[PDB]
Design a protein around this nucleic acid. Sequence first.
DNA 1: GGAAATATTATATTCC
DNA 2: GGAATATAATATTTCC
Lengths: 54, 54
Amino acid sequence: KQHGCTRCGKNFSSASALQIHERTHTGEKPFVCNICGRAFTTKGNLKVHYMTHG
Amino acid sequence: KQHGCTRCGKNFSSASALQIHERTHTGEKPFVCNICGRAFTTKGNLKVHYMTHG
DNA sequence: GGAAATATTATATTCC
DNA sequence: GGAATATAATATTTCC
Ligand SMILES: [Zn+2]
Ligand SMILES: [Zn+2]
Ligand SMILES: [Zn+2]
Ligand SMILES: [Zn+2]
């Protein structure tokens, strides 16, 4: 239903989607590259980052 | 000095960077996937998309 | 310097 | 269901 981020007002599809959005305001970045120590917000963004390391 | 959008006031690094942004207003999508026919505003985004077909 | 490419990132869309 | 994936758009780096 309405997965409201009660700080920006925006709506989201899942309970995980809104949760992934929460780390915009908090700034968690819970996934770190094994090669360059870069922190990323989502597992998917860290993956596509791994293509600088070819 | 700058290259700011007539329409949303965002400003960009270069002439070419502003042209790319303005495509979000015009809906201009010059980069067309030969497989599925989908269109993209940037050459870079089409090439990422190309790798989704295999 | 500036076009171009690349890296980046927030979030819809996908998929049985 | 909800993680993987694809998208849109901008920011940074590369390249001549
Ligand atoms: Zn929010
Ligand atoms: Zn890395
Ligand atoms: Zn604009
Ligand atoms: Zn395609």
